[PDB]
């Protein structure tokens, strides 16, 4: 019990992980990458904010 | 605008509270499991605030029970465990019904046939012996104040007075805080309770307390973890000392220890010899110097650069006069020095 | 042997992740991402500084409008602003004031909060002004609560020391499901994008992945040296970053099943508290110990900025919805809008 069950259920969750099907890198990286790409250009904290449109002028 | 006067209603209020919390005293209650923190949160009440109502003493009628019921169990449990041999023969089908009823009643029930089995087996003389070996299993601190008094409780009309109520034993998950004044001031104590989780991650929330009020029950130390049967409850409590005096969180902290059940221990020091916390101890076994060797092991863990002493203090948590006492001394300290 | 056969097991089936993950992994972002432009030196600008709280602020949320935001500090109160007229909407007395986190509902209707009381309190907004009507006492907990974020006016997942995370039906009160794994008290969620999978951050150093629906864990993700104190979902579902008390951030991608990069610098020395990534991703924003916010180019790992301004403990952050601004909150009792 307990110390066993508790890893007895580890193993448990690593079976189940085990068969997890993974992506490649690169695919996932590449697909991030175009993910930020096509929109920092409109990012107000990466190009900063033209004073008439922020909010938070004085 | 109507927003802005809002706003300005709110920091008003808001004035009031830091003028208040300037004005505040925090008080931290630290210790292991059964030390007396509970009990000095509820003395707090009944010295500071006016005690319980009729109400809230009815309430604590099924805690009393279940706290009854647990302590007579637990000792029942031990004659097997122990095996002790009952002084009368007919005390094991009363054991046997007691247990079966046990788990067949509602929780914080006495039922007259429960109460009447209870009472049998209190009087018994291996119960009496199995009890008096209760540093060797897990015994409730008052199971012999119910058990000794279970008549009264069980009387129709009964209302639980308010040693009974300091007596009892809840099981709580949360912090508990008491707010009350004294000397002019208001007061803030807090007992993290049932929390179920690393210090690490929470105890810099009372960087900055006034005082921390640390319990030790001097009569642990012949005495075993619930759950840890290997680890005696002194050197636990040695160890959480240790912990928390040297803190990062706490360098300059005003630390109070709060050696108490002296009570318990008094009647106890008589019985184990202290060696069975502290091998290496060579003085008598005495109220005087085994209590003075255990305060000194406690304050000895102090590293801190800032020498400040940490005051002491023998209580006797379930006595109402003697914390009314001590916390007046503290107080007194406390403010003459904060 | 039983315990031993366990923990050869389980090993066993550890080495077989890694090499799993390995052999996923052909590139590096970094590599990927080299022939990116630098974001340049991020300059923002303390814009408002919100002046109201007593004693340490431990959590903030941008309400959906990106105007209005609540924080928690242990002053024991619960403050609703207008960030533009810096006007306090609300300032709730909790019940007990050792608050460790709040959540905003996305409808604003309502707000939400606990900490050492092991409780996650609701307070309906649409009802009282100034101070407020707590609706509900979510009891279940048996450590303190670390987070809280809602997916609904009736749902709420919840994060905690003793472990665990649950969801709630907030009418009911009730815990639809509780979500058991993690080996360390449970410092941080963020839901999915679609609310349908959430991962949360642990004392075990690790994150996890989990289905709301149905309340396993998919995948638990590993790498962090101390605590992960934060964590956050990527704007597009398929990653998260995490803060951890090793001085690092890392950003985690589900699909390849491991992270994809680490934000550190060998003069950044001291814990993360919080992390938030900007609008569209390119930066990655974290709160320190130290007292700064740092500001990270998540594609290229650079620190492109730092957010000083705060006297103690930067302890939450949060960015707009509309991405207009961040929100820091600190130990030194102040919050403040940087642009
Ligand atoms: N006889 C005696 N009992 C005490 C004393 N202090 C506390 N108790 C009892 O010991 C038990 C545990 O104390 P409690 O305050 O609940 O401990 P906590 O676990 O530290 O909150 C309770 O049944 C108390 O009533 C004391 O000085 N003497």
Redesign the interface.
């Known amino acids: 019990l307990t110390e066993k069950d508790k890893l007895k259920m580890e193993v448990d969750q690593l079976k189940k992980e085990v068969t997890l099907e993974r992506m490649l890198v690169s695919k996932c990286c590449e697909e991030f990458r175009d993910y930020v790409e096509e929109r920092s250009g409109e990012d107000p904290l990466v190009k900063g904010i033209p004073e008439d449109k922020n909010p938070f002028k004085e | 605008?109507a927003?802005?006067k809002?706003?300005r209603?709110?920091?008003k209020?808001?004035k009031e509270?830091?003028e208040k919390?300037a004005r505040t005293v925090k008080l931290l209650l630290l210790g292991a499991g059964e030390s007396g923190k509970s009990t000095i949160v509820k003395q707090m009440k009944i010295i500071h605030q006016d005690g319980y109502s009729l109400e809230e003493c009815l309430e604590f009628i099924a805690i009393i029970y279940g706290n009854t019921l647990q302590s007579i169990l637990a000792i029942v449990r031990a004659m097997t465990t122990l095996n002790i041999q009952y002084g009368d023969s007919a005390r094991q089908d009363d054991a046997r019904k007691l247990m079966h009823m046990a788990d067949t009643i509602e929780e914080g029930t006495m039922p007259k046939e429960m109460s009447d089995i209870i009472q049998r087996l209190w009087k018994d003389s291996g119960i009496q012996a199995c009890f008096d070996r209760a540093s060797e299993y897990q015994l409730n601190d008052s199971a012999g104040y119910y058990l000794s008094d279970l008549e009264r409780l069980v009387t129709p009309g009964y209302v639980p007075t308010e040693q009974d109520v300091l007596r009892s034993r809840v099981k709580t998950?949360?912090?508990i805080?008491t707010q009350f004044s004294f000397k002019d001031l208001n007061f803030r104590m807090?007992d993290?309770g049932?929390?179920?989780?690393?210090r690490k991650?929470?105890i810099h929330?009372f960087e900055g307390v006034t005082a921390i009020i640390f319990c030790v029950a001097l009569s642990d130390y012949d005495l075993v973890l619930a759950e840890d049967e290997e680890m005696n409850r002194m050197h636990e409590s040695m160890k959480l000392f240790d912990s928390i005096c040297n803190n990062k969180w706490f360098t300059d902290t005003s630390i109070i220890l709060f050696l108490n059940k002296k009570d318990l221990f008094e009647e106890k020091i008589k019985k184990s010899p202290l060696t069975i916390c502290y091998p290496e101890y060579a003085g008598s076994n005495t109220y005087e110097e085994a209590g003075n060797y255990i305060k000194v092991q406690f304050l000895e863990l102090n590293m801190r650069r800032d020498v400040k002493e940490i005051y002491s203090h023998m209580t006797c948590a379930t006595d109402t006069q003697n914390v009314k006492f001590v916390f007046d001394a503290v107080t007194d300290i406390i403010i003459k020095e904060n | 042997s039983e315990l031993d056969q366990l923990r050869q097991e389980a090993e066993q089936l550890k080495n077989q992740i890694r090499d799993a993950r390995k052999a996923c992994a052909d590139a590096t972002l970094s590599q990927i991402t080299n022939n990116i432009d630098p974001v340049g030196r991020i300059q923002m600008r303390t814009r408002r500084t919100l002046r109201?709280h007593?004693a340490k602020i431990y959590a903030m949320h941008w309400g959906t409008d990106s105007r209005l935001l609540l924080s928690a500090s242990?002053?024991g109160?619960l403050i609703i602003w207008?960030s533009y007229?810096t006007?306090?909407?609300?300032?709730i007395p909790l019940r007990?004031?050792?608050v460790?986190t709040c959540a905003y509902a996305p409808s604003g209707n309502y707000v939400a909060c606990g900490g050492?009381?092991?409780?996650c309190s609701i307070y309906n907004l649409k009802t009282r002004?100034?101070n407020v009507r707590v609706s509900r006492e979510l009891a279940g907990?048996?450590?303190?609560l670390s987070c809280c974020r809602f997916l609904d006016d009736n749902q709420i997942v919840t994060s905690?020391?003793?472990?665990t995370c649950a969801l709630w039906d907030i009418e009911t009160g009730q815990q639809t499901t509780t979500f058991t794994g993690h080996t360390?008290?449970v410092?941080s969620l963020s839901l999915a994008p679609d609310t349908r999978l959430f991962v949360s951050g642990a004392?075990d150093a690790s994150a996890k992945l989990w289905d709301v629906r149905e309340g396993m864990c998919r995948q638990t993700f590993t790498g962090h040296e101390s605590?992960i104190n934060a964590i956050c979902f990527f704007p597009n579902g398929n990653a998260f970053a995490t803060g951890s008390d090793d001085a690092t951030c890392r950003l985690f991608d589900l699909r390849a099943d491991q992270e994809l990069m680490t934000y550190s610098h060998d003069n950044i020395i001291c814990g993360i508290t919080s992390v938030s990534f900007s609008k569209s991703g390119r930066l990655l924003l974290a709160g320190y110990d130290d007292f700064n916010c740092n500001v990270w180019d998540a594609l290229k790992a650079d620190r492109a900025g730092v957010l000083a301004g705060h006297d103690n403990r930067v302890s939450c952050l949060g960015v707009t919805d509309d991405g207009m601004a961040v929100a820091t909150g600190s130990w030194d009792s102040f919050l403040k809008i940087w642009n």
Do not use: P
């Not at chain 3, 006007?87 to 300032?91: Q, Y």
């Open positions: 605008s927003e802005e809002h706003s209603e709110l920091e209020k808001l509270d830091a919390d998950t949360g912090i805080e807090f993290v049932g929390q179920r989780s690393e991650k929470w929330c | 109201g007593l242990q002053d109160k207008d007229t006007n306090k909407v609300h300032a007990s004031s050792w460790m050492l009381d092991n409780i002004e100034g907990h048996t450590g303190y905690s020391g003793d472990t360390g008290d410092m004392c605590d």
